[PDB]
Design a protein around this ligand. Structure first.
Ligand SMILES: NS(=O)(=O)c1c(F)c(F)c(S(=O)(=O)CCO)c(NCc2ccccc2)c1F
Ligand SMILES: [Zn+2]
Length: 257
């Protein structure tokens, strides 16, 4: 039932998923002036050299690039984390217009899109068990602005027309997610949730301060996808973002400045 519309969008979610009005929901606005610098936060360690992508999938809400997470191949550690967290999939959130699309905001500024690289804590042995734990996921969030093309993104954009509608999927091997990272790993970090149902409160969010630039033609290709399945009426996959939620009793920490 849930989705992104007038009748089943974010403002409706709490009827099926009451944790939508919980104590540590995401995303949030990052108020850069009131983020606390923590000189004890460590550099983020992103070890993606052995990554193995498998498939790309239109799930009706976004597209996911899935990875083999059956060994320690692509891992996030360090930063604010105590564990080792395995990459399972990345996906994006984007807008109908370049002026919106991100889930997190920075001093109320929306970006055109937001990449989420989803990782699960290896102490829990698999993703489905990890989402049931308060320290089960680490999601690395990267803002996209429209400008110059991101060449490392183009392999993703070029396959989208094969997964146009809900439930479609395609082989997607040898994709290197290092091509999607900005130069700096400076980040903000806070405890939150999945930003789609089931909205579980299992995520340590790590949001990079520096956005990547993508071209207008790259983001236009994301907006040609469909939320509907093949042979159902066309509804463009745009505006699949959840807006900022109340910060409540949380402090956002900065690794920098
Ligand atoms: N946008 S998010 O990064 O905060 C997010 C969600 F909001 C979310 F609900 C999910 S969920 O659908 O998997 C939770 C269901 O137990 C994932 N996880 C991505 C994923 C999806 C399918 C298979 C593997 C990973 C997820 F990454
Ligand atoms: Zn997401």
């Amino acid at each position: 039932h849930w989705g992104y519309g007038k009748h089943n969008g974010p403002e409706h979610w709490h009827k099926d998923f009451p944790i939508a009005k919980g104590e540590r929901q995401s995303p949030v606005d990052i108020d850069t002036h009131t983020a606390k610098y923590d000189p004890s936060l460590k550099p983020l360690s992103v070890s993606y050299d052995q990554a193995t992508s498998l498939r790309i999938l239109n799930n009706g809400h976004a597209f996911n690039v899935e990875f083999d997470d059956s060994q320690d191949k692509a891992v996030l550690k360090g930063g604010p984390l105590d564990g080792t967290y395995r990459l399972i999939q990345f996906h994006f959130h984007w807008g109908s217009l370049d002026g919106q699309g991100s889930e997190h905001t920075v001093d109320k500024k929306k970006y055109a899109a937001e990449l989420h690289l989803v990782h699960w804590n290896t102490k829990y042995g698999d993703f489905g068990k990890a989402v049931q734990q308060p320290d089960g996921l680490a999601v690395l969030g990267i803002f996209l602005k429209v400008g110059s093309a991101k060449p490392g993104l183009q392999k993703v954009v070029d396959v989208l027309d094969s997964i146009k509608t809900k439930g479609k999927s395609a082989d997607f091997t040898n994709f290197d997610p290092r091509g999607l990272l900005p130069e700096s790993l400076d980040y903000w970090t806070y405890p939150g949730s999945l930003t789609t149902p089931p909205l579980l409160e299992c995520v340590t969010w790590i949001v990079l301060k520096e956005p990547i630039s993508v071209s207008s033609e790259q983001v236009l290709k994301f907006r040609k996808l469909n939320f509907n399945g093949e042979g159902e009426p066309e509804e463009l996959m745009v505006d699949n973002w959840r807006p900022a939620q109340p910060l409540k009793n949380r402090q956002i920490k900065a690794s920098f400045k």
